[PDB]
Design a protein around this ligand. Structure first.
Ligand SMILES: [Zn+2]
Ligand SMILES: [Zn+2]
Lengths: 132, 131
């Protein structure tokens, strides 16, 4: 019987839980996480091994988001390579009104498909007619 | 003639740009001839004027509607790329169950995913660039 050291009310019981996690505007569920969990406030306590498993999953998610994400500077370059204004690019690639104005200030993440479309248009500027 | 809606304004012949929203998409219908109330902007359009107006309304509805892709088309492109739905979901985005719902018609892909799938339908080899 260990009492939760955060809420000081509930009991910590060992279990396996799926943990929601958001990083750089991307969401995931960290699946099958072993640890002690407070029945009252859901605070988690992980031993050395459990923490290793958890952090490997967290860091694999971060690595993948970072590799997929593109710099504001890349977005501008691809847009300028296509001689598009921010408004035309938002319309052509997607994202809504002011999408590219926000993307280029580093103030928003494009949808994964917008990023990928940008990556393809970077290498294939001739495809612009197919998407406009 | 007095305006038949507000009863406190004269209807005058003119031309106006009329904003119009359809399925949450906004446009301005340009150069619409009609009688317009000076007070409340109620419009009265004769047959000929209504046909012109409705032809713009309908051309805008049709282009908005046509942005949607047949779920059949989504299956066509996916099979074509030798991808499962789990993989497509991971590649194109939308979430864990994305592509299963698209092909049942229970969800619409993001506009960029549609564009990316239309591009890939014509040039399926480019997947290897963004996989
Ligand atoms: Zn607690
Ligand atoms: Zn009136």
């Amino acid at each position: 019987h260990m009492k939760c050291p955060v809420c000081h009310q509930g009991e910590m019981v060992s279990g396996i839980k799926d943990i929601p996690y958001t990083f750089r505007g991307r969401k995931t569920v960290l699946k099958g996480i072993h640890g002690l969990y407070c029945v009252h406030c859901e605070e988690s306590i992980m031993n050395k091994e459990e923490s290793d498993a958890f952090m490997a999953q967290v860091k694999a998610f971060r690595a993948s988001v970072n590799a997929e994400t593109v710099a504001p500077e890349f977005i501008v370059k691809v847009r300028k390579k296509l001689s598009l204004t921010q408004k035309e690019a938002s319309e052509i690639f997607g994202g809504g009104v002011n999408a590219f104005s926000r993307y280029e200030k580093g103030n928003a993440q494009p949808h994964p498909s917008t990023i990928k479309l940008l990556r393809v248009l970077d290498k294939h500027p001739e495809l612009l007619n197919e998407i406009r």
